[PDB]
Design a protein around this ligand. Structure first.
Ligand SMILES: *[C@@H]1O[C@H](CO)[C@@H](O[C@@H]2O[C@H](CO)[C@@H](O)[C@H](O)[C@H]2NC(C)=O)[C@H](O)[C@H]1NC(C)=O
Ligand SMILES: CC(=O)N[C@@H]1[C@@H](O)[C@H](O)[C@@H](CO)O[C@H]1O
Ligand SMILES: CC(=O)N[C@@H]1[C@@H](O)[C@H](O)[C@@H](CO)O[C@H]1O
Ligand SMILES: *[C@@H]1O[C@H](CO)[C@@H](O)[C@H](O)[C@H]1NC(C)=O
Ligand SMILES: *[C@@H]1O[C@H](CO)[C@@H](O)[C@H](O)[C@H]1NC(C)=O
Ligand SMILES: *[C@@H]1O[C@H](CO)[C@@H](O)[C@H](O)[C@H]1NC(C)=O
Ligand SMILES: *[C@@H]1O[C@H](CO)[C@@H](O)[C@H](O)[C@H]1NC(C)=O
Ligand SMILES: *[C@@H]1O[C@H](CO)[C@@H](O)[C@H](O)[C@H]1NC(C)=O
Ligand SMILES: *[C@@H]1O[C@H](CO)[C@@H](O)[C@H](O)[C@H]1NC(C)=O
Ligand SMILES: *[C@@H]1O[C@H](CO)[C@@H](O)[C@H](O)[C@H]1NC(C)=O
Ligand SMILES: *[C@@H]1O[C@H](CO)[C@@H](O)[C@H](O)[C@H]1NC(C)=O
Ligand SMILES: *[C@@H]1O[C@H](CO)[C@@H](O)[C@H](O)[C@H]1NC(C)=O
Ligand SMILES: *[C@@H]1O[C@H](CO)[C@@H](O)[C@H](O)[C@H]1NC(C)=O
Lengths: 198, 368, 459, 44, 50, 99, 49
């Protein structure tokens, strides 16, 4: 917490965003997409996959006739992903970069306060103790102009940066509705292969 | 002598201005003809009089379009000090005419008007084409055509109630662009550390050779302020372009055809869209299809009998309580399970969930 | 195509005035020179306004001081006549001179005029040896040595209780460590070759606007308007073409400025008449040419003009005539109007055309089905890679010079954020040509005998 | 180990432009590629 | 006297701050109610405990 | 909605002043108070460095008139010290102080 | 990965001088030496070699 700098918390606390995630997970397994498109319904999951298999072309007999195989692969696949995220630190690269970029840019803004910008000194107090009001003034002007440009370039970078982040948020919002709340027919929108559920 | 610093700044704003003409053209200009609705309005019960242009109003804008125009709003007279607003290439009259062409095509020439010759068919016989595209058989409409029409008419007329209660996406752009430019004109009053903010007010005191420094302070001041506005607007224009590109795609698939994306042109299954002109934007009246009043049954993967499995052609086996029926996917239309609507496979000894049941053999009555 | 070049401009050709009679008040010289001025310790406040100004000094006589606090085109100033005249008078030792100035703060800056900044009016500290000096010492002037320092610029120090720097109170005595709160001038004409008495009377105008009081004689020639001229009215000179002032105003509101400091403040002291300043049409320009190959003919297009001339929303097209019929767009002019080189011969500007209009019949029963087909082939060009140049940063910015490595580092390592990304562009160039063509993983080859059931692939 | 890369160079003007840098000045393995003359890597 | 350069940065900067709240609101807030998983979790073999 | 209006930062309560001592212990004292003072013709000096100087005097003790030569903070010193010491030793006739 | 550090420079290796074969002489003399002048009115700008 440096001078003039502050950070505000997200709209939804992590303890609360987990509430939305819990509801969406709880609603998707007990009501398929029915809760997204109207009131939730009691369609049991084992046969709901037969609905999702039927939605890509494969008949619904493949599920029941091979339900045990499907369940084991689902459980095995879910178990394996945990290791992938924890096995390597590069899995959450995209989330890491946004935090690192913002912090690095924020540090540069504060670090710019040391630069003299052509003035005698980089402190407003000593100059007033060494420069006459005219001198101090006629020299402080060169100091503010340096900081405003340094600060302004920070605001512009956030605007440039925030625009690209808002692109992902829109895609995350749209991808979450189409993938989580329904089966996507788009060839490449829910991972390689014919989408089943997310 | 400062250089051609903004010999390119005009290029940036001029380039942005010219592009906007492309945005409004790629979106609405999706047809090489201007179709017109027939004078007789008989679409099997559907009432489009709330979205097609009304000849009574000289402006020739449909009531929904008229509502939007009144909804969205110094501000317009800036004394013309270095700034001006270029008029749009094609006026709202041209944009409205473009939109009416799309409505006159989707309503009559269905969608085949965007893929070559614009063949036309009766609307009740076109909604059956679109109903068939979401897993509901054609007959489901003609049995409920009167109910569907009375349900589409009321629903479309309820949009104004929502709007009349809105256009934040469009209003934000107008306000944000105006505010960003407003600060540019309001920052000329700043002194940038000089004696005064008026150029003509400080041009009769100091030596011109010794006056260059004082004026140069304002030269580097306002120039940076102008540059930031150009850079800021240049970035935002890209944001609108992405929305413009998104709008063009919707006007090419959701309206000029029936899409299959889950949630891309509305909440639920997609039937048809109706574009509507709006100030610096477009409003899509997606006409989706949502189920309700569902009921719970009992289902098995495939009916097995006499050591011979049987599977549904297109439908899910259900249970009325004591007999077994084969119904379509979305709507509930039970049928007598017959070999005509179900094929055979396997041996019934490998599947799980098979339920013994009897199907009907048509040959029996022919030999009695 | 269509190009753009230097636009159109107009120049005013009048600057008449009408108001002069700047009273007669002449207190400027009064402050400039009068009876012997007071000591540096005590100033004397004088304000000059609603006067003829008469900037016939400084350049006059000699000695004096510089200004460093003005605008452009100096001469006898005039034109802009400022707002106030803060006439300050006093007497200084005369050797300092630079002490009361923009910089060089020594010991005089303790409680004397600090000259914060601007200080419109400069200083006129000349040499006066005959006056302000007497053989019998001529103390008169009495200024303090030091009292707490930094006594603020506009804060006259007329008090007592000298600082008496020490660990004990002053006690109202002048003895051990108790100095006197005043320094005696004690200078006579004989002594002080460089410290002879000098007269300085500084002034402050705090310039705040061009049209104001305390002006200098002008020329009431007459009043002009409605021609987009820049006549010189009082301090201001206008910009553009005047218009009627329908806006309501009040007696205590004779200056107009909404957001851009427009010249709405022309209250016309001569004859109270608020004027509305507004520049006339700027104009545009663009050359519509069919190319230097076909013919050396063109048709200029402007941006905003109220005009063989076609009135277009984008401007006026000169040299091209509009035709009632419409053709296919060739040169995009904008606003739905395109010009082209179509039949003597000339340049034609017309209204763009969408396409041929055709319809298809139908009733409750009809449909169209093709009977024959036709295979077609069409190209689709697509850029993949671009020849990537490798431009360095130093040489270009700075070649081989001794000061090249010292002044370059004053900014930092900005070349790090300059040449780092250029290589990335280069690498991505080949990654574009690797994923495009190297799709298949095995390199095949067609059979030696070309027999594909009739198709010919020799091309 | 590292492989220095230069943008505008050939296999002759690199050496001309403490003792460590002399190692890459001459170079026992020099590759002239599009991006430049990367030093220290062997093409295969 | 430097002008409104100060405010423009503050107001513009706050826009991104409010924007973030709008980003999360349109991602997770896709249901008008709250759903709880059933106590018994027999899903025909599938394990969602992860 | 919410609008970020202004800021309310906590101001410093006070300011603490003191010196870290450092190169100190000036022998400057053994200059004025001494014995066997030299004559006027004889010249003497005593360089002082690597110490704290500690001028004081003037406003301390009694007598010891000033010399009317100061820059910033007259009769305060501290800020201006000058890296040099010149301990001259001579006696005037006693009636030519201004001389 | 690949990172960028600096940009190697190349410095000169020689310098020379070259002037014509002309030479004169007026060290504050031919050009600056008394030269009784006329009144202010007859201040014609005389030409010097
Ligand atoms: C959780 O999912 C896994 C999927 O196989 C299963 O849990 C396994 O249960 C067996 C039986 O005791 C254990 O030997 C394994 O160690 C468990 N984990 C794994 C990864 O195999 C089970 O189907 C599900 N239920 C529970 C309670 O674990
Ligand atoms: C200095 C003095 O004694 N008298 C001056 C005179 O020299 C000067 O010419 C005149 C014009 O301002 O003002 C008075
Ligand atoms: C052009 C002209 O006349 N200017 C002024 C005007 O105010 C008036 O004529 C007179 C005042 O009585 O003084 C003079
Ligand atoms: C069939 O033709 C008649 C002819 O008058 C017309 O009234 C009717 O609307 C047509 N039906 C359809 C579905 O277009
Ligand atoms: C099943 O169909 C028969 C048809 O005769 C009907 O009588 C019966 O009510 C249906 N099942 C239930 C649970 O109602
Ligand atoms: C279905 O018919 C087969 C035929 O033998 C029989 O073995 C089986 O038990 C029947 N199913 C049930 C649930 O009784
Ligand atoms: C010039 O002639 C025509 C002009 O339309 C042009 O198409 C052609 O390419 C040009 N040829 C040469 C040789 O300049
Ligand atoms: C252009 O000039 C004509 C000439 O009278 C005038 O009537 C018209 O109003 C002008 N244009 C505009 C936009 O006012
Ligand atoms: C174009 O049409 C208008 C409409 O009457 C007519 O007045 C004009 O003469 C036509 N153009 C020419 C060149 O005749
Ligand atoms: C090919 O097209 C022609 C008309 O272009 C048609 O007459 C002919 O019948 C078509 N081919 C066949 C095999 O019919
Ligand atoms: C690069 O420099 C070498 C140095 O001799 C030279 O032979 C060669 O022609 C230059 N160009 C290329 C492409 O290698
Ligand atoms: C000499 O005597 C004075 C008088 O009190 C006192 O400061 C001290 O004893 C001697 N001076 C110094 C500097 O020690
Ligand atoms: C002209 O130049 C030559 C050298 O090129 C030199 O020897 C000669 O003296 C010059 N002429 C003069 C100085 O009159």
């Amino acid at each position: 917490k440096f001078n003039g700098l502050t950070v505000l918390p997200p709209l939804l606390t992590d303890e609360m965003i987990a509430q939305y995630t819990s509801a969406l997970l709880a609603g998707t397994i007990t009501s398929g997409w029915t809760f997204g498109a109207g009131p939730a319904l009691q369609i049991p999951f084992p046969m709901q996959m037969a609905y999702r298999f039927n939605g890509i072309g494969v008949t619904q007999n493949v599920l029941y006739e091979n339900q045990k195989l499907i369940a084991n692969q689902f459980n095995s696949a879910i178990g394996k992903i945990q290791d992938s995220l924890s096995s390597t630190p590069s899995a959450l690269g995209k989330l890491q970069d946004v935090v690192n970029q913002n912090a690095q840019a924020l540090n540069t803004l504060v670090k710019q306060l040391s630069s003299n910008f052509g003035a005698i000194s980089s402190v407003l107090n000593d100059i007033l103790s060494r420069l006459d009001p005219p001198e101090a003034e006629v020299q402080i002007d060169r100091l503010i102009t340096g900081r405003l440009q340094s600060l302004q370039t920070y605001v512009t970078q956030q605007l440039i940066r925030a625009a690209e982040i808002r692109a992902s948020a829109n895609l995350a919002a749209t991808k979450m509705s189409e993938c989580v709340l329904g089966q996507s027919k788009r060839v490449d929108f829910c991972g390689k292969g014919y989408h089943l559920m997310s | 002598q400062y250089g051609s610093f903004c010999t390119q700044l005009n290029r940036a704003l001029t380039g942005i201005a010219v592009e906007q003409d492309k945005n409004t053209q790629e979106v609405f200009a999706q047809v090489k003809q201007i179709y017109k609705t027939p004078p007789i309005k008989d679409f099997g019960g559907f009432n489009f009089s709330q979205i097609l242009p009304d000849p009574s109003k000289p402006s020739k804008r449909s009531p929904i379009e008229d509502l939007l125009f009144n909804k969205v709003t110094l501000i317009c007279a800036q004394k013309f000090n270095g700034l001006t607003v270029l008029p749009p290439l094609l006026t709202d009259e041209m944009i409205a005419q473009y939109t009416s062409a799309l409505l006159a095509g989707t309503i009559t020439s269905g969608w085949t008007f965007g893929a070559g010759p614009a063949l036309q068919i009766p609307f009740p016989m076109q909604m059956a084409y679109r109903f068939n595209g979401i897993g509901v058989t054609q007959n489901v409409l003609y049995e409920n055509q009167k109910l569907i029409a009375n349900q589409f008419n009321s629903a479309i007329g309820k949009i104004q109630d929502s709007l009349s209660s809105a256009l934040g996406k469009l209003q934000d752009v107008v306000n944000q662009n105006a505010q960003a430019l407003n600060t540019l004109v309001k920052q000329l009053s700043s002194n940038f550390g000089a004696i005064s903010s008026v150029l003509n007010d400080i041009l009769s005191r100091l030596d011109p050779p010794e006056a260059e420094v004082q004026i140069d302070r304002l030269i580097t001041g306002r120039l940076q302020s102008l540059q930031t506005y150009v850079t800021q607007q240049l970035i935002r224009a890209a944001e609108i372009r992405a929305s413009a590109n998104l709008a063009a795609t919707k006007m090419s698939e959701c309206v000029l055809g029936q899409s299959k994306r889950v949630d891309f042109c509305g909440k639920g299954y997609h039937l048809m869209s109706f574009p509507q002109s709006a100030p610096h934007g477009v409003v899509f009246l997606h006409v989706t299809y949502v189920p309700a009043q569902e009921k719970n049954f009992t289902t098995a993967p495939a009916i097995c009998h006499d050591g011979k499995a049987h599977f549904p052609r297109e439908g899910v086996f259900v249970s009325n309580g004591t007999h077994w029926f084969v119904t379509q996917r979305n709507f509930y239309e039970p049928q007598i399970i017959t070999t005509d609507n179900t094929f055979v496979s396997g041996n019934c000894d490998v599947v799980i969930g098979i339920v013994n049941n009897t199907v009907y053999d048509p040959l029996q009555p022919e030999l009695d | 195509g269509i190009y753009q070049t230097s636009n159109f401009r107009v120049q005013p050709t009048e600057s008449i005035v009408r108001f002069p009679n700047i009273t007669n008040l002449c207190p400027f010289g009064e402050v400039f020179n009068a009876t012997r001025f007071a000591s540096v310790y005590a100033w004397n406040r004088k304000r000059i306004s609603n006067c003829v100004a008469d900037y016939s000094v400084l350049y006059n006589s000699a000695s004096f001081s510089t200004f460093k606090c003005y605008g452009v085109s100096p001469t006898k100033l005039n034109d802009l006549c400022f707002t106030n005249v803060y006439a300050d008078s006093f007497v200084i030792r005369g050797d300092e001179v630079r002490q009361i100035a923009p910089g060089q703060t020594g010991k005089i800056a303790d409680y004397n005029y600090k000259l914060p900044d601007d200080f419109t009016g400069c200083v006129i500290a000349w040499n006066s040896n005959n006056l302000d000096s007497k053989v019998g010492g001529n103390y008169n002037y009495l200024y303090r040595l030091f009292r707490k320092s930094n006594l603020k610029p506009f804060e006259r120090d007329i008090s007592t209780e000298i600082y008496q720097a020490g660990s004990t109170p002053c006690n109202g005595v002048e003895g051990f460590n108790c100095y006197f709160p005043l320094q005696s001038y004690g200078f006579q004409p004989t002594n002080g070759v460089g410290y002879q008495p000098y007269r300085v009377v500084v002034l402050s105008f705090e310039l705040l606007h061009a049209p104001a009081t305390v002006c200098g004689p002008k020329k009431s020639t007459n009043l002009v308007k409605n021609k987009c001229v820049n006549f010189n009215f009082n301090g201001l000179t206008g910009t553009g073409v005047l218009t009627e002032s329908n806006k309501k105003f009040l007696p205590f509101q004779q200056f107009g400025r909404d957001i851009a400091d427009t010249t709405d403040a022309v209250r016309d002291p001569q004859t109270l008449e608020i004027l509305d300043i507004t520049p006339c049409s700027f104009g545009g320009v663009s050359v519509i040419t069919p190319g230097t190959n076909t013919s050396n003919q063109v048709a200029v297009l402007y941006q905003d003009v109220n005009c063989n001339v076609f009135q277009t929303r984008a401007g006026c097209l000169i040299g091209a005539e509009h035709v009632n019929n419409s053709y296919e767009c060739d040169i995009p002019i904008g606003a739905g109007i395109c010009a082209s080189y179509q039949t003597s011969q000339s340049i034609i500007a017309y209204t763009m055309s969408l396409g041929a209009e055709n319809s298809v019949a139908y009733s409750n029963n009809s449909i169209a089905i093709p009977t024959n087909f036709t295979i077609s082939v069409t190209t689709e060009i697509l850029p993949v890679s671009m020849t990537k140049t490798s431009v360095d940063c130093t040489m270009y910015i700075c070649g081989d010079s001794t000061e090249c490595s010292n002044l370059l580092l004053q900014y930092g390592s900005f070349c790090t954020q300059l040449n780092r990304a250029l290589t990335g562009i280069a690498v991505e160039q080949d990654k574009n040509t690797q994923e495009v063509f190297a799709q298949v993983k095995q390199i095949y080859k067609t059979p030696p005998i070309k027999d594909f059931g009739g198709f010919n692939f020799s091309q | 180990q590292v492989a220095v890369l230069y943008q505008d160079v050939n296999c002759t003007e690199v050496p001309v432009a403490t003792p460590t840098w002399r190692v890459y000045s001459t170079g026992s393995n020099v590759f002239q590629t599009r991006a430049g003359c990367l030093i220290g890597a062997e093409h295969v």
